[PDB]
UniProtKB/Swiss-Prot annotation:
A ribonucleoside 5'-triphosphate binds at residues 262-269. Zn(2+) 12 binds at residues 16, 19, 33, 39. This is Helicase nsp13. Zn(2+) 13 binds at residues 50, 55, 72, 75. It is found in: Host endoplasmic reticulum-Golgi intermediate compartment. Residues 237-418 form the (+)RNA virus helicase ATP-binding domain. Interacts with nsp8 to form the replication-transcription complex (RTC): nsp12, nsp7, two subunits of nsp8, and up to two subunits of nsp13. Interacts with host TBK1; this interaction inhibits TBK1 phosphorylation and decreases by 75% IRF3 phosphorylation, which leads to reduced IFN-beta production. It catalyses: ATP + H2O = ADP + phosphate + H(+). The chain holds residues 5325 to 5916 of 7096 of the full protein. Residues 1-105 form the CV ZBD domain. Plays a role in viral RNA synthesis. Multi-functional protein with a zinc-binding domain in N-terminus displaying RNA and DNA duplex-unwinding activities with 5' to 3' polarity. Activity of helicase is dependent on magnesium. Binds to host TBK1 and inhibits TBK1 phosphorylation; the interaction with TBK1 decreases IRF3 phosphorylation, which leads to reduced IFN-beta production.
Amino acid sequence: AVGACVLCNSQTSLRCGACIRRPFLCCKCCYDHVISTSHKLVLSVNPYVCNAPGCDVTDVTQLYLGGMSYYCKSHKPPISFPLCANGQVFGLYKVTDFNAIATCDWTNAGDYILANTCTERLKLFAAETLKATEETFKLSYGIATVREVLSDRELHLSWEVGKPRPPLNRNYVFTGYQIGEYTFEKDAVVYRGTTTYKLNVGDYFVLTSHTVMPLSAPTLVPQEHYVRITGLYPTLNISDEFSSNVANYQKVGMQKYSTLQGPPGTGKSHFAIGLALYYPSARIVYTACSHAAVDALCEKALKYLPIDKCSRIIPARARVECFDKFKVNSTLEQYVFCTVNALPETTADIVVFDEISMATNYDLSVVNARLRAKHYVYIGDPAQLPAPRTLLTKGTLEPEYFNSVCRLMKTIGPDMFLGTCRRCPAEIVDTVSALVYDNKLKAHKDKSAQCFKMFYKGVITHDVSSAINRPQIGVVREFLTRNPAWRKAVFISPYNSQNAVASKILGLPTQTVDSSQGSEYDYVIFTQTTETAHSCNVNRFNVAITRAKVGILCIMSDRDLYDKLQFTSLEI
Ligand SMILES: CC(=O)Nc1cc(C(=O)O)ccc1F
Ligand SMILES: [Zn+2]
Ligand SMILES: [Zn+2]
Ligand SMILES: [Zn+2]
């Protein structure tokens, strides 16, 4: 129990017994915590509890030191000293924000705002506390035992009574029993088991509650600016392809860490891989939270970098199918592509952390702890979607509060900005540029004249909380008959249930706005479904319409976002 204070690093025997993470608190700051919160249990080698037999006094403000032992007001000897006095809690080696992080339930937006505006040590305390809270919340759900196997992709479930049911969507990954991880979608239920094992009747699934490890490394290392490119060796033979990024690659070598805001289709993956061509001797570790983001970096590297110097790091618990074209699990390769949670303990000349809006401060810290690099590059877009915060139910999380990197990008601005969108028709670029990019995003493509909008509220039904709008899907069906080229479109909506219905009625491939992030398609059909805060969220709206390379049909519910759309309006 010998440690350093989470608020002023002073060595202490004291560690708050009422905090879920039991943080070490020094004498002077353990006091401010206990005297202004419900937290009154103080721990040491021997905790602060009345030593008298059968006494239940554990509140440090009601305890005293009687020689070498502790007692309450009823058991103390005449020569005793209160543990709480003169703004201190008695201990060896003798705050409003810390109190809020230590006591909050993580269901309010203001809890995440604070977890991002506090000191660096408090950012790690908040991240550790939040993740531990998110995990103890998984224990708080109902178990599902298999009743009958219908076919190879459909089954029927019997749920635990008296305990709430977790959301049936592609946002909750169960763990069957040890039959591998399983997922569920909209009595006919759809089963997506990662391991192809015939779901035996009787076997059960349970949500993967994993232990929350302590954070040590900061979310962002201290920033250093250099006068020359440091530890990196540039090429004078850089292909014209990557010529536009030379000044930004140099900026990368002249700073400890750099932020790159790249709107959709502005060249983030091209920049990340071109940085390897600009410093061809540099060992680069490419990291992101999801397997999809790591795989998209692998795809771009396959085109520009030598395959024998690349390696895809895949964990022993190989959860889903990922990139198969690099030598698997060779940690020593010049180019290492691996997700944040599977990162080995290694060093690099550059670490590239892609899709930074999806990172949490927990992820940021983990990367700083497993990777010791000369340079760190954070690539993403605060105008895109953040990681879902399962506990957050009240208020909206603004982009400046997604993580430490997003906070910098939204407050001081990003170090580098990719200003030309090359993917989208100009109608889409013009709309999102004005919506979330302060008119700084430019279109490379001309208008496609294939970007349409229809204002149609329809009828909103629900499958628990996931929404469905059958009339909006009906309008899409009518549109498809009159527009056969749209037969190849991807159907996108903010709700899994809407997508399940559209898959059956339209036969189009389906994506939620959140799973479409990072992907692109020629044609996109978007139904807004509802006018909720979820479906009207400007970041989600931005991701949704920026998936299209050629055309987009938007069936809207919200007048505001419909009027912003610089698309041709349709009637019916
Ligand atoms: C290859 C690729 O990803 N495309 C791309 C390249 C540039 C550029 O050459 O500046 C800019 C934006 C882009 F989306
Ligand atoms: Zn302290
Ligand atoms: Zn506490
Ligand atoms: Zn007592």
